[PDB]
Write a structure and sequence with these properties.
Elements: H1 10-23, E1 28-35, E2 41-47, E3 56-61, H2 68-84, H3 89-97, E4 99-103, H4 108-116, H5 169-180, E5 185-193, E6 197-200, H6 212-230, E7 235-238, H7 239-242, H8 250-256, E8 261-267, H9 282-302
Parallel strand pairs: 3-4, 3-5, 5-8, 6-7
Antiparallel strand pairs: 1-2, 2-4, 6-8
Helix pairs in contact: 2-9, 3-9, 6-9
The structure holds zinc ion (5 copies).
Protein name: Carboxypeptidase B
GO molecular function: metallocarboxypeptidase activity; zinc ion binding
EC number: 3.4.17.2
């Protein structure tokens, strides 16, 4: 049984992607953008009412296997879209005028592993030459100052950058999709946990994006909007100085492709539960995060 207020295993999420699509044909279509190391289909939902020359926002969850609230949020976003379309003015305008690409779980193999073997697994489940240590950090595997800072060259490490940029089937699939759709995708949003932050480029070097003032102001306003619901306090800024320097991130890579609105969300909490955020917090976390995501979406729509 699927529930939006519990953490769902991969079999359940996969079945949900099929069911939510079948139940909402006028608003949702599903494709597979590739396969994981272990051969699992990487599903992508396109959410929106069909129309001509629509701009798009791309959102992914589940880069890091143990960050279960991330996976839960992508599902919640789709929940909100199908529930409130036609009833709530903003969501209806969003879905009429733009498409949302929602990738519910990128690192499917790692996610399965957190359910079956090791709740605290982070990386992919691919093999590495010359060692029995498993996995690459998908958010150190993109072609963005690749493997230079905040990333490890040791395959046994949690931030292992991989053998080469896009060495992982999952990151290659994501990068390929974005490159193939670069004329339509106007914003890139990537959902992580934890630490309550909205980050934007750059993480791979201490340098700032050309539109730094715009991104800073947008992140500041989105943080303020998020806080209105339950008073949850987020920080924001360029990745390198807000959390830490880290090379090979998808947000930096997306920005360097020309996607001007590129953000990483780090959801609840600030360390009390960390990655093992209780199910009792899914609803509140997702509802407040919705406010930030809708704020960014409205901004993108209004500044095309
Ligand atoms: Zn359900
Ligand atoms: Zn399957
Ligand atoms: Zn993460
Ligand atoms: Zn993180
Ligand atoms: Zn709601």
């Amino acid at each position: 049984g699927h529930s939006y207020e519990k953490y769902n295993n991969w079999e359940t999420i996969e079945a949900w992607t099929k069911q939510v699509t079948s139940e909402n044909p006028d608003l949702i279509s599903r494709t597979a953008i590739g396969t994981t190391f272990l051969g699992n289909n990487i599903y992508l939902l396109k959410v929106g009412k069909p129309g001509p020359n629509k701009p798009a926002i791309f959102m992914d969850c589940g880069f890091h296997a143990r960050e279960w609230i991330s996976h839960a949020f992508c599902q919640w976003f789709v929940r909100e879209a199908v529930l409130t379309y036609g009833y709530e003015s903003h969501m209806t305008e969003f879905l009429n005028k733009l498409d949302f690409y929602v990738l519910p779980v990128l690192n499917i193999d790692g996610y399965i592993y957190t359910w079956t073997k090791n709740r605290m697994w982070r990386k992919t489940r691919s093999t590495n030459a010359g060692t029995t240590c498993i996995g690459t950090d998908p958010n150190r595997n993109f072609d963005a100052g690749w493997c230079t800072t905040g990333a490890s060259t040791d395959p046994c490490d949690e931030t292992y950058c991989g053998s080469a940029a896009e060495s992982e089937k999952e990151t290659k699939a994501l990068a390929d999709f974005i490159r193939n759709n670069l004329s339509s995708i106007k914003a890139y949003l990537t959902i992580h946990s934890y630490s309550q932050m909205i980050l934007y480029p750059y993480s791979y070097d201490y340098k700032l994006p050309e539109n730094n003032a715009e991104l800073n102001n947008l992140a500041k306003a989105a943080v303020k909007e998020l806080a209105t619901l339950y008073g949850t306090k987020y920080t924001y800024g360029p990745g390198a100085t807000t959390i830490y320097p880290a090379a090979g991130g998808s947000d930096d890579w997306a920005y360097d492709q020309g996607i001007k609105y590129s953000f990483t969300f780090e959801l609840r909490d600030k360390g009390r539960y960390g990655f093992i955020l209780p199910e009792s917090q899914i609803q509140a976390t997702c509802e407040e995060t919705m406010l930030a995501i809708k704020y960014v979406t409205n901004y993108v729509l209004g500044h095309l």
